[PDB]
Amino acid sequence: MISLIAALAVDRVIGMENAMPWPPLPADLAWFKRNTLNKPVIMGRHTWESIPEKNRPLPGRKNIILSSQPGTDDRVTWVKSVDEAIAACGDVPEIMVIGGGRVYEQFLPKAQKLYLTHIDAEVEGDTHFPDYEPDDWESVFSEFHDADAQNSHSYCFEILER
Numbered sequence: 001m002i003s004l005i006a007a008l009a010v011d012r013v014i015g016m017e018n019a020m021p022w023p024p025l026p027a028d029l030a031w032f033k034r035n036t037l038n039k040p041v042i043m044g045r046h047t048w049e050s051i052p053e054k055n056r057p058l059p060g061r062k063n064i065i066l067s068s069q070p071g072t073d074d075r076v077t078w079v080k081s082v083d084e085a086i087a088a089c090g091d092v093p094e095i096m097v098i099g100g101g102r103v104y105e106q107f108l109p110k111a112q113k114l115y116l117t118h119i120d121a122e123v124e125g126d127t128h129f130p131d132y133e134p135d136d137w138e139s140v141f142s143e144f145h146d147a148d149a150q151n152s153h154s155y156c157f158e159i160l161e162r
């Protein structure tokens, strides 16, 4: 099955100028790693270029990058369509789609699960997560956490299934 995972600040904002528009929340990164470890991850080229080299390729995961153009990094698998991205995952229990905006828009109609981090921050953005709440998603997990010394905004992890 196909799953999307995303951090959304207020009004579904997920990015600004190819970066996330809040300071790093290490607890959200630890949630991301927990949920994506040992699964293939599919990402657009802008998202691959936004991950610091210190954690690239994402370890313990098969990294699959969408680009219409030839690949520029032999360390990961490059693919030129959605169908090619899915094929490279192989027969596994769950495929994780990790962004960005144009990638999420294409995969949301195919997904049976969403892993969302809701961040209590009103920030400016140029990229939003697609409208999902109107469809037939039901929440099956949620967990709120207050801001602390290592995370400067409060956040709420959520899993929804179709």
Ligand SMILES: NC(=O)C1=CN([C@@H]2O[C@H](COP(=O)(O)OP(=O)(O)OC[C@H]3O[C@@H](n4cnc5c(N)ncnc54)[C@H](OP(=O)(O)O)[C@@H]3O)[C@@H](O)[C@H]2O)C=CC1
Pocket: 005, 006, 007, 008, 013, 014, 015, 016, 017, 018, 019, 020, 043, 044, 045, 046, 047, 048, 050, 066, 067, 068, 069, 079, 080, 081, 082, 098, 099, 100, 101, 102, 103, 104, 106, 127
């Ligand atoms: N808050 C969060 O959880 C996350 C936020 N983000 C943010 O999202 C933003 C990036 O999103 P966005 O600009 O939409 O970019 P994406 O990461 O979705 O990358 C889009 C690129 O991927 C390639 N691509 C997408 N679809 C196809 C396709 N069907 N066939 C071939 N190639 C395809 C294209 O590359 P090419 O141009 O080479 O053809 C396209 O330009 C950034 O701000 C980033 O920080 C990203 C991930 C998570």
Ligand SMILES: CN(Cc1cnc2nc(N)nc(N)c2n1)c1ccc(C(=O)N[C@@H](CCC(=O)O)C(=O)O)cc1
Pocket: 005, 006, 007, 026, 028, 029, 030, 031, 032, 033, 047, 050, 051, 052, 055, 058, 059, 097, 098, 099, 116, 117
């Ligand atoms: C910019 N980017 C995309 C990104 C960031 N936060 C997200 N958060 C959520 N919830 N979902 C996403 N898809 C998401 N994507 C990144 C940036 C860094 C790392 C990264 O360093 N990740 C380590 C996390 C370990 C760590 O905390 O350093 C990993 O192994 O996953 C991942 C994604």
Ligand SMILES: [Ca+2]
Pocket: 053, 054, 055, 056, 057
């Ligand atoms: Ca590296």
